[PDB]
Scaffold this active site. Structure first.
Site, PDB file in Angstrom:
ATOM      1  CG  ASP A   1      -1.892   1.201   1.230  1.00 29.80           C
ATOM      2  OD1 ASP A   1      -1.940   1.957   0.215  1.00 29.80           O
ATOM      3  OD2 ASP A   1      -2.587   1.390   2.257  1.00 29.80           O
TER       4      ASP A   1
ATOM      5  CG  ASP B   1      -3.295   4.679  -2.799  1.00 31.95           C
ATOM      6  OD1 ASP B   1      -2.703   3.719  -2.286  1.00 31.95           O
ATOM      7  OD2 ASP B   1      -4.344   5.131  -2.288  1.00 31.95           O
TER       8      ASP B   1
END
Ligand SMILES: NC1=N[C@@]2(c3cc(NC(=O)c4ccc(F)cn4)ccc3F)COC[C@H]2CS1
Length: 389
Positions: A37, A233
């Protein structure tokens, strides 16, 4: 040459549910699958039973567990997690051959955090300490890794979408990509790497200077593209765009693809569309180019994605042999998010040492024989003020 064979093909997963890497925590080591992440900065793992967890971190069985005696509460738009902070020894089996002492948030309660069937039990927040919870004193994993070892302050991600649906068995058996810790593996990309500056070290924040749909300039003031930030992201599925940019892009994508009409729910990202096996009309959908600020003053470069990136394969709601997809571009109120479906087009280098992000065409991007993803430059005639303050 591919110089990081140990770490090549160490990811599994898909854009719907996330890409994860195997990690171990504690002594003796407890194996967990962990979501990669780049849009958060906590290492947080399931640490108590949950209907969607097949395993979890058991602190009482780890001789090296250290209790920090402090809670952490992390609500976010789509859900929440909370838990208890501590430290332990952590390794990545298909990673550098090092073990580090790192902060771990032991998740004790959550809402819509875990995904049934994703096969991951925690998340590895790879962004910077500024956005760590509860605050920036909680050193993120990667910072600990760099401080404690000789690993270079850089990692790179090749996320590989299949271009078709993978059932539970297939997604477990399939290679989902690579996370190269400490380096750049030349086998994972074609063409040249082009770098854009990291604007500020919190998220991996970048600046988009121009957007084109099939070569046609969206022609918005470039601040709109980065309102109120643009980030890379891996912990988000979609390409997310600020409301006004989303509205303009969708209008233009509709116009480009207008030889077929799709329902509003498709464009809203809610409803799938299906074509007879093998007949998906890729050629009616436009390519999308995002121009990013170059490292050289007054220069930019562009990354170009195909509908094979922004249409996410999904299995049909009813049983069929149709090829079905969801539209994986959606509206944001928190800026542009280059999510997993964008990252699937590119090998992405998070060069923390040199405060820059590199993009090259991925060796595993999905395409057809008529068009490929591209990373091209330089462009020297653009108006570049594009950052939001
Ligand atoms: N970048 C983000 N990270 C966070 C987060 C991400 C995810 N990610 C996914 O389920 C997912 C699924 C498919 C994908 F292709 C990628 N990611 C799950 C929980 C979660 F809390 C943690 O900090 C804020 C929060 C919201 S935005």
């Amino acid at each position: 040459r591919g110089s990081f064979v140990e770490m090549v093909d160490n990811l599994r997963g898909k854009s719907g549910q996330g890409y994860y890497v195997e990690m171990t925590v504690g002594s003796p080591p407890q194996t967990l699958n962990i979501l990669v992440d780049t849009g958060s900065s906590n290492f947080a793992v399931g640490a108590a039973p949950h209907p969607f967890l097949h395993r979890y971190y058991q602190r009482q069985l780890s001789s090296t567990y250290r209790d920090l005696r402090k809670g952490v509460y992390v609500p976010y738009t789509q859900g929440k997690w909370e838990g208890e902070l501590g430290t332990d020894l952590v390794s990545i089996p298909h990673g550098p051959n090092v073990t580090v002492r790192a902060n771990i948030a032991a998740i004790t309660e959550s809402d819509k955090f875990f995904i049934n069937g994703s096969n991951w039990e925690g998340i590895l927040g790879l962004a910077y300490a500024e956005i760590a919870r509860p605050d920036d004193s909680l050193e993120p994993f990667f910072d600990s890794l760099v401080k404690q070892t000789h690993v270079p302050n850089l990692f790179s991600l090749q996320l590989c979408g299949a271009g078709f649906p993978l059932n539970q068995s297939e997604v477990l058996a399939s290679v989902g990509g690579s996370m190269i810790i400490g380096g750049i593996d030349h086998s994972l990309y074609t063409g040249s790497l082009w770098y854009t500056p990291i604007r500020r070290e919190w998220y991996y924040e970048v600046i988009i200077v121009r957007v084109e749909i099939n070569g046609q300039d969206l022609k918005m003031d470039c601040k709109e593209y980065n309102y109120d930030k643009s980030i890379v992201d891996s912990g988000t599925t979609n390409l997310r765009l600020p409301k006004k940019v989303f509205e303009a892009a969708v209008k233009s994508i509709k116009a480009a693809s207008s030889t077929e009409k799709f329902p509003d729910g498709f464009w809203l990202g809610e409803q799938l569309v299906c074509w007879q096996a093998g007949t998906t009309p890729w050629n009616i959908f436009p390519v999308i180019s995002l121009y990013l600020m170059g490292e050289v003053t007054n220069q930019s470069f562009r990354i170009t994605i195909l509908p094979q990136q922004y249409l996410r394969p999904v299995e049909d709601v009813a049983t069929s042999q149709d090829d079905c997809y969801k539209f994986a571009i959606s509206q944001s109120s928190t800026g542009t998010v280059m999510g997993a479906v964008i990252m699937e087009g590119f090998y992405v280098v998070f060069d923390r040492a040199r405060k820059r992000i590199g993009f090259a065409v991925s060796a595993c991007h999905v395409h057809d024989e008529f068009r490929t993803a591209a990373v091209e430059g330089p462009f020297v005639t653009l108006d570049m003020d594009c950052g939001y303050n």
